[PDB]
Design a protein around this ligand. Structure first.
Ligand SMILES: CCNC(=O)N1N=C(c2cc(F)ccc2F)C[C@@]1(CCCN)c1ccccc1
Ligand SMILES: Nc1ncnc2c1ncn2[C@@H]1O[C@H](COP(=O)(O)OP(=O)(O)O)[C@@H](O)[C@H]1O
Ligand SMILES: [Mg+2]
Length: 330
């Protein structure tokens, strides 16, 4: 039930120059990804995997949005909860996919940059989906990050990222938690979302200088909650609450990452139908408990490299993402 897609990144400027041969081949039609596990493109062994969707190195950012995000967002607009994870070795594109980048030399505005990833596009489409239908709505965003099992808020400008938040169990609704001090910024208009990301980025830098390899070892959960009141052409004002969680996971490459380690154990228990699922063993799995075997619609975009020097990691990632397909939750 949990949908899993694979995204291979293209070779960089230094790989094309070193005349690199891709050990990875994608077949979107057959939704399969094939990787050469032994030398020689003249003769060799291969390992194949089938996923709900596969996107080759030529896949553009807009292709990921129209294909995976747009549908998920729709479901969020209907009043449901959805989560999208990005799993993969450092350098394969987790952040590129989830956040994206800016085209060089200020060639475009943020809302039109073809390099923009899921988060900016989503925030911009929410304001162009509901506004363009006259519905009373309200968007809230939060950016909770995890590093060495400590929680950080990368968006409230009052305190710095050296302030560790506390987590407790939410006695109201089961399988949930309360983060004391977590900030929920309100996004009033499109012209306000970039500003928010700008701030987050500035704090991301601070966390990086304060914590070792922060960008590779941390887990980030960017949440967007939409409070809606759709007044159709009739007059019925329906009450809808939708939450979308965009999770940029720590690099899967393998000191110890308790949340990553626990996320793996949790998937294992869910797919092997074991009675006890270790959700409580990490901040990530407790925070996102409802996204693993709960009532939330979840999708995992596993990122991979086409370079042969990343073979071992590429297989581990695919093997992992492949096992994840058997998780049933809704
Ligand atoms: C520096 C100014 N900010 C900035 O460019 N951006 N800041 C980003 C960003 C910052 C966060 F805290 C959390 C989630 C995010 F999405 C996304 C990014 C790219 C960020 C780097 N991967 C962007 C915005 C709009 C269009 C294309 C890219
Ligand atoms: N799909 C892609 N298309 C073009 N470049 C990509 C793609 N994915 C990743 N890259 C590039 O690969 C490098 C790794 O980026 P990044 O997303 O930060 O990795 P990660 O988040 O997995 O650690 C960057 O220079 C980025 O620009
Ligand atoms: Mg990264």
């Amino acid at each position: 039930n949990i949908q899993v897609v694979v995204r291979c990144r293209p070779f960089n400027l230094a790989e094309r120059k070193a005349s690199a041969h891709s050990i990875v081949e994608c077949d979107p039609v057959r939704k399969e990804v094939s990787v050469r596990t032994g030398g020689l493109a003249d003769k060799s062994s291969r390992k194949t995997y089938t996923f709900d969707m596969v996107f080759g190195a030529s896949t553009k950012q807009i292709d990921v949005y129209r294909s995976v995000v747009c549908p998920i967002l729709d479901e969020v607009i209907m009043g449901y909860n959805c989560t999208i994870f990005a799993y993969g070795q450092t350098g394969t594109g987790k952040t590129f996919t989830m956040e994206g980048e800016r085209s060089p030399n200020e060639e475009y505005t943020w809302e039109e940059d073809p390099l923009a990833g899921i988060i900016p596009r989503t925030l911009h489409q929410i304001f162009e989906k509901l506004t363009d239908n006259g519905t009373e709505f309200s968007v809230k965003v939060s950016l909770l990050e995890i590093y060495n099992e400590e929680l950080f808020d990368l968006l409230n400008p009052s305190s710095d990222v050296s302030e560790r938040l506390q987590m407790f169990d939410d006695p109201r609704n089961k399988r949930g938690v309360i983060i004391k001090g977590l900030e929920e910024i309100t996004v009033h208009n499109k012209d306000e979302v970039y500003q928010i990301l700008e701030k987050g980025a500035a704090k991301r830098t601070t966390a990086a200088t304060l914590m070792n390899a922060y960008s590779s070892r941390s887990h980030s959960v960017f949440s967007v909650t939409i409070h809606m009141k759709e007044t159709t052409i009739d007059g019925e004002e329906l009450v809808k609450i939708g939450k979308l969680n965009l999770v940029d996971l720590a690099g899967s490459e393998n000191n110890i990452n308790q949340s990553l380690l626990t996320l793996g154990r949790v998937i294992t228990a869910l797919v092997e139908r074991t009675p006890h699922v270790p959700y409580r063993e990490s901040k990530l799995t407790r925070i996102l408990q409802d996204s693993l075997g709960g009532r939330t619609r979840t999708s995992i975009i596993a990122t991979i490299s086409p370079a042969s020097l990343n073979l071992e990691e590429t297989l581990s990632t695919l093997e992992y993402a492949h096992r994840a397909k058997n998780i049933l939750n809704k």
